[PDB]
Design a protein around this ligand. Structure first.
Ligand code: ZN
Ligand code: ZN
Ligand code: ZN
Ligand code: ZN
Lengths: 285, 285, 279, 274
């Protein structure tokens, strides 16, 4: 039932129960925290008030104080190994990552290593092969670059729209493609465009984008100036050597005054992901 | 207790009864200015909290010009306010607000010309008048001994705050009646806040632009964002709610608000904090 | 009997307890960031006894003027928004600093009020008269006994062998005897010349005195860490910068509890002192 | 249950439990006139954290040899009469100080008198083997097989700023790894760069380590107030010159806090980055 690759892995995998349901997302929200700093979300859209589309969206908890690498949400096939250091991680995780990045050479090296171990042949071979095949089969349950484009559509999505005060830049759609198509689907669920064309009409959803794609990887960054403050809830996640941090935090009184005011309309303040443009065909000409 | 200015009417929401500086029902707020009494929760995620007002615009997307105007400039009041439709009390209120002494005295003589004034309704009417008067009087920051902002100053552009530049919008704000200034400063959340030692950016991009024509909802650039809500045409568009159910997973997903709240102007705090926050003094710069 | 001066007008319990200190610990903490305490002493043996020493409480990250514990009579008018607190405290401050001009100014400002010609005048006379009475009980006039007296004894270690001291050592003699005494009561002389031998009790003085007043400055290097602990304004808020650590040895701490604890503080030491024959 | 070295054939309650001190505090005083202690410190964010430290009680003593806290391998056999101990414990000290020539000299007298039934050979050799095993548990490099892989520490602060502690640190490295370990227990650094955070903890170091041994104090002039052949029979008697109160006037101050009354060992420089 549980789709999650981590739920396939064998420790604990206390997946968020959603993964047992129709949505079919590749990852439990828990592991979404684990490596991605992001929460799946919805942004319902409607005109006749039938709430029709309920389109998915994602929010990130990237700390404002993060710099450099930590700004990167998802590293490129270049240097993801350096970003992650999978030796901090189990062999199953290493396998999965190498598969996703198509590091088939490393996959070969791991299978060579395990070959000569008796615990491989005696016990683990069924686990390794079942996980390998199952994972790849899941990927190829979509892989719309392959498989007749059975899943989704051409979809007419673009992420590449000009920043008008930028130069005529734009690159690494090649890299987008090179991402295993489950990644591309994930993005197509994470990031809404600022714009959509209806078959006869265009609609705009935010004043400005919120995220960018470097050749290095997806980066939550302002196009200019300081990053916005992110109040990371800190409700959710080792320091075997002791770990320390400074932090800047509130102090002050008077909060009681809100007792009455709390009745008013209240605004959620998370950081959504915006980038790109969409259209629906009037006809599949 | 009910302190909506439109209690004077000779109907307000119960929410008006809170002792709060709105001095208006959400009812009349909507019915005149297409806005809602909203608030911002702000957190430092120890569950240390801070809070501010919000009011999303409600005016429909398509309509233009005066339709984009939320409240006209005094020089342009009647262009929006079709006074002839609007009851003399309403007219007098507005004229006072805009300082239209001329119209005030005009209505004064109209009292006599309304030979029904012989009915001694004048007593009630003028009582209502003075009632109204009271509130403006209280709002008047110019009263010598009234308390004023000194830890704080609000501005209506980034540059205007950052260098006290001759922001024409800020100039015209000052020129407006003190009540209007008060209501604006009450309603409008900034894009940025400087702090006694720090600065915070809430969004990379402002909501709207305003100019000497009046209070204006216009976007800074491009098209207005989507804004949802007998011999006539309902003209409704409709779209394929095919019932492709997904709630079985999505129901837990957090839903981003579909609203256009205010991120307009720039606040400075630049002093040893002595907020004294629990008082609605005019608190002028 | 309440000993604290401020109790005239929330005092710590030691105010009403038999403190030899002038001031309640609450007021001391608020104003000058210090805590009242002691050190024991031994006649080479279990035959042991005490001497008072305070420790200051100022943070590691305080800088410039903030480094001052007790400013001089000049700079204190800048260090403290004297307007920030009730007129009576202003008058008390001016009296203790001998700012009698400002005292008279406050008196005139009060008399200007039309409500002064009432029981307000009685209250004011009573309060400041009692304050002055205590002050003059502390201020030398024919003072000769052990109690509440000192007599030409030096902290300048180098000239104290000559029974002399530098102008900086003289400095506090410029202040009221109240100040001079309570200073020396709080801060231990690090060298001592007992009537029989001279000894040292610490090698590295923890605090310094300047014309600006009492500076809780390190003589050298970076300032030492301080945990600000315990101890208000509905009006006020701000942001705090908080260091913290993780990786707790919680179950090893059980074993760590098994041996003597040495707490850490900044006890106040400087200079030198001569001691009289005692009985 | 848990044991110190001196469980080797008395033991102390201090040695019912250990964290790599592996001596009674009894023996700490008995040998080097010091007591072990903990140094709790905190941030008020419920952020308590503790360090190990020791204190000596040998202030106001004179001419060095009286209050040297630790000998040197060059001189320990001189400053301590080896005849003070029996049952070849001299060999244990020779191991600790790396005088394996003296170890062999003792073994020359342990093979002599075979002790067929009592197996005095074994009687010494079991202790010696456990000593060597513990010493290489405190191996001078603590190679990763040796749990308790130490973090960096420096003592010559001035080159610890260059991470190049000089002759003092070289001599420390030459000293037996157990000595190094126990120094890590006893001596708090004057400075720690905890993720570059160069904290300072005291006005000044107290003790100083010479190539000849640990000296309780750098200065010998400004000595600090310090409370506390025919052996087993000596007596000393004291005289004091200070008429005063009958130790009751101080009862006024019975309520207030008192500052600690010790001279802990503060010395050196440390870095702990990532
Ligand atoms: Zn999972
Ligand atoms: Zn109303
Ligand atoms: Zn008091
Ligand atoms: Zn023992």
């Amino acid at each position: 039932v549980n789709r999650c690759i981590f739920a396939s892995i064998v420790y604990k995998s206390p997946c968020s129960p959603d993964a047992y349901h129709d949505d079919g997302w590749f990852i439990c929200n828990n592991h979404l925290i684990k490596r991605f700093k992001m929460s799946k979300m919805v942004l319902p859209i409607f005109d006749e008030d039938d709430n029709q589309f309920k389109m998915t969206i994602a929010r990130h908890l990237v700390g404002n104080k993060e710099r450099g690498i930590k700004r990167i949400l998802i590293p490129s096939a270049t240097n993801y190994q350096d970003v992650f250091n999978l030796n901090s991680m189990m062999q199953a995780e290493q396998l999965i990552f190498h598969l996703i990045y198509n590091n088939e050479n490393a996959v070969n090296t791991i299978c060579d290593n395990l070959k000569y171990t008796e615990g491989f042949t005696s016990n683990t071979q069924r686990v390794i092969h079942s996980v390998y095949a199952t994972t790849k089969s899941i990927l190829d349950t979509t892989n719309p670059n392959t498989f007749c484009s059975r899943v989704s559509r051409d979809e007419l999505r673009f992420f590449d729209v000009t920043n008008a005060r930028a130069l005529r830049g734009g690159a690494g759609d090649q890299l987008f493609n090179n991402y295993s198509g489950f990644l591309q689907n994930l993005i197509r669920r994470a990031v809404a465009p600022e714009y959509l064309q209806i078959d006869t009409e265009e609609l705009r959803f935010r004043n400005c984008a919120t995220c960018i794609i470097d050749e290095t990887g997806l980066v939550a960054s302002v196009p200019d100036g300081p990053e916005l403050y992110n109040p990371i809830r800190s409700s959710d996640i080792q320091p075997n050597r002791l770990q320390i941090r400074n932090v800047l935090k509130f102090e002050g009184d008077t909060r009681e005054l809100d007792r009455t005011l709390s009745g008013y309309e209240e605004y959620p303040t998370y950081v959504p992901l915006f980038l790109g443009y969409q259209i629906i065909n009037s006809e599949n000409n």
